[PDB]
Design a protein around this motif. Structure first.
Motif, PDB file in Angstrom:
ATOM      1  N   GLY A 115       0.789  -1.218   0.000  1.00 40.33           N
ATOM      2  CA  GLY A 115       0.000   0.000   0.000  1.00 40.33           C
ATOM      3  C   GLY A 115       0.824   1.273   0.000  1.00 40.33           C
ATOM      4  N   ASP A 116       0.208   2.377   0.425  1.00 43.12           N
ATOM      5  CA  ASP A 116       0.885   3.663   0.444  1.00 43.12           C
ATOM      6  C   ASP A 116       1.090   4.207   1.859  1.00 43.12           C
ATOM      7  N   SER A 117       1.059   3.318   2.843  1.00 47.77           N
ATOM      8  CA  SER A 117       1.312   3.721   4.213  1.00 47.77           C
ATOM      9  C   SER A 117       2.794   3.463   4.332  1.00 47.77           C
ATOM     10  N   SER A 135       0.194   6.445   7.870  1.00 52.73           N
ATOM     11  CA  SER A 135      -0.727   6.268   6.759  1.00 52.73           C
ATOM     12  C   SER A 135      -0.698   7.550   5.933  1.00 52.73           C
ATOM     13  N   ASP A 136      -1.103   7.469   4.666  1.00 47.20           N
ATOM     14  CA  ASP A 136      -1.096   8.638   3.789  1.00 47.20           C
ATOM     15  C   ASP A 136      -1.543   9.902   4.525  1.00 47.20           C
ATOM     16  N   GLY A 137      -2.372   9.731   5.547  1.00 46.44           N
ATOM     17  CA  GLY A 137      -2.863  10.861   6.311  1.00 46.44           C
ATOM     18  C   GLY A 137      -1.772  11.802   6.776  1.00 46.44           C
ATOM     19  N   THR A 152       1.838  11.939   5.752  1.00 48.65           N
ATOM     20  CA  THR A 152       2.599  12.426   4.612  1.00 48.65           C
ATOM     21  C   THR A 152       1.875  13.291   3.575  1.00 48.65           C
ATOM     22  N   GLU A 153       0.550  13.215   3.521  1.00 46.71           N
ATOM     23  CA  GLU A 153      -0.189  14.018   2.551  1.00 46.71           C
ATOM     24  C   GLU A 153      -0.302  15.463   3.009  1.00 46.71           C
ATOM     25  N   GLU A 154      -0.090  15.679   4.307  1.00 44.58           N
ATOM     26  CA  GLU A 154      -0.157  17.017   4.885  1.00 44.58           C
ATOM     27  C   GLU A 154       1.226  17.526   5.260  1.00 44.58           C
TER      28      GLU A 154
HETATM   29 MG    MG Z   1      -2.331   7.928  -0.625  1.00 42.88          MG
END
Ligand code: MG
Ligand code: MG
Ligand code: MG
Length: 235
Positions: A118-120, A187-189, A191-193
């Motif tokens: 995944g992307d985590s 989780s993407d949570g 790194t996305e911010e």
């Molecule tokens: Mg993502």
């Protein structure tokens, strides 16, 4: 070593399909899974992944620690199966899925095994320096290495994730742990911010419970577009 976990819905999503678990008793393994899926499919998926990997590890830890790769690979499948089984039943959650990042420490806590689908991500911080261990299983990510950090089009689509009958890639790889450095599971949570820079700063925080919180707080302040979960382990 000191470990700390913390999840959160964020500022937008009302639900939370992220999940995590820390082996508080022995501190041998850690998990984080970003779930997805309508009709509460994401919650089910991530929980299933965590429960199943967790249970599988607690069963064959002593039995297969001499062979971590098989152990982790097998664990992930146990979860992938669990999830796929649910899809075949509840048709409202046919499209449920989840990501997962796991760290497996050697008996002698010097080596660290990193498994993921995944992307985590899994990060390693050492002497004021953050390094990303896992490689996002996504198309745009898998574009680069033929594409620049101009990522923004379809940059969200996963190319691998637990809950697919064709699952063809469970990235497992070891890294050495030198007393002092820190380990991160997110989780993407996150790194996305937050940029690796920002992330590195907060991770420097001596207290893992303080860092973990700083990380989530920071994350939500840049916006809370996605559910964010973090597990900070100080070696
Ligand atoms: Mg993502
Ligand atoms: Mg999600
Ligand atoms: Mg997410």
């Amino acid at each position: 070593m000191d470990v700390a976990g913390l999840t959160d819905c964020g500022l937008i999503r009302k639900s939370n399909q992220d999940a995590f678990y820390i082996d508080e008793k022995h501190q041998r393994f850690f998990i984080v899974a970003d779930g997805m899926g309508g009709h509460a499919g994401g919650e089910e998926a991530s929980r299933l992944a965590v429960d199943h990997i967790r249970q599988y590890l607690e069963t064959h830890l002593e039995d297969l620690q001499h062979d971590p790769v098989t152990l982790l690979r097998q664990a992930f499948l146990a979860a992938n199966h669990a999830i796929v089984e649910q899809q075949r039943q509840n048709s409202a959650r046919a499209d449920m899925g989840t990501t997962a990042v796991v760290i497996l420490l050697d008996e002698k806590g010097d080596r660290a095994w990193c498994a993921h689908v995944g992307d985590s991500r899994i990060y390693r911080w050492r002497k004021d320096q953050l390094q990303q261990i896992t490689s996002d299983h996504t198309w745009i990510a898998q574009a680069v290495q033929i594409e620049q950090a101009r990522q923004h089009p379809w940059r969200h689509v996963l190319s691998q994730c637990l809950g697919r009958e064709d699952l063809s890639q469970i990235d497992i790889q070891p890294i050495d742990l030198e007393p002092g450095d820190r380990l991160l599971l997110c989780s993407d949570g996150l790194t996305e911010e937050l940029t690796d820079d920002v992330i590195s700063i907060y991770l420097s925080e001596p207290n893992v419970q303080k860092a973990a919180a700083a990380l989530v707080d920071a994350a939500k302040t840049h916006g809370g577009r996605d559910n964010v979960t973090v597990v900070v382990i100080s070696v």
